[PDB]
Design a protein around this ligand. Structure first.
Ligand code: HEM
Ligand SMILES: C[As](C)(=O)[O-]
Ligand SMILES: [Zn+2]
Ligand SMILES: [Zn+2]
Ligand SMILES: [Zn+2]
Length: 126
C-alpha cells in the first residue's frame, strides 16, 4: 500500500527531475549556492537523484523546500518546479498526489519556524 521512494517516487523523479538534478548537477546544495553560474549555464540545479539527496529538501536541512517547489498553489502561484510534474494539469495533479503521500504532511515552513512535532510528521518512507 504505502507510498515509498523505491516504488513510487524514484520512477517519477528519474523521468521528470533527474535531467537537471542528477549526474550533471551540483553534487550538493552548497556546492550549487557557491558557484551558481557554473551550474545554471547548463540549466542544472543540485543533485537530488538518490534518496538521501532528496530527503535533504523535506524535513532537514532544507526543510519544506520540496513541498514549496512542488506546490500547485491552492497567492495561487505554484512552486517553480510544479510544471515538471507533467505535460498536462491532470498528470501534474496525479504526480503531485504521489509526492504528498510520500512526504506525509505537506509542510511549507522553513527550518527556523518549524516545531519538532511537525518534523515528526514527515515520513518520507524509503
Ligand atoms: C519534478 C521534478 C523536479 C523536482 C522535484 C525538483 C525539485 C527542486 C527543488 C526542491 C528545488 C529547490 C532547491 C532549493 O531549496 O534551493 C529545485 C531547484 C532547481 N531546479 Fe528542480 N526540480 C525538478 C525538476 C527540474 C527540472 C526538470 C529542471 C530543469 C529543466 C530543474 C531545474 C532546477 C534549477 C536550475 C534549480 C535551482 C534554481 C532554483 O531554485 O530555481 N528542476 N528543484
Ligand atoms: C541554513 As545555513 C547554516 O546553510 O545558512
Ligand atoms: Zn545551508
Ligand atoms: Zn531550499
Ligand atoms: Zn520538465
Amino acid at each position: 500500500g504505502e507510498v515509498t521512494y523505491r516504488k513510487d517516487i524514484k520512477p517519477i523523479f528519474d523521468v521528470r527531475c533527474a535531467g537537471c538534478h542528477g549526474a550533471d548537477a551540483a553534487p550538493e546544495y552548497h556546492a550549487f549556492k557557491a558557484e551558481k553560474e557554473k551550474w545554471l549555464a547548463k540549466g542544472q540545479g543540485m543533485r537530488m537523484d538518490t534518496y538521501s539527496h532528496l530527503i535533504f529538501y523535506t524535513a532537514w536541512p532544507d526543510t519544506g523546500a520540496l513541498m514549496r517547489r512542488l506546490d500547485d498553489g491552492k497567492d495561487a502561484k505554484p512552486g517553480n518546479m510544479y510544471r515538471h510534474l507533467g505535460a498536462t494539469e491532470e498528470e501534474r495533479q496525479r504526480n503531485l498526489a504521489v509526492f504528498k503521500a510520500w512526504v506525509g504532511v505537506w509542510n511549507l515552513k522553513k527550518w527556523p519556524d518549524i516545531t519538532k512535532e511537525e518534523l515528526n510528521a514527515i515520513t518520507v518512507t524509503y
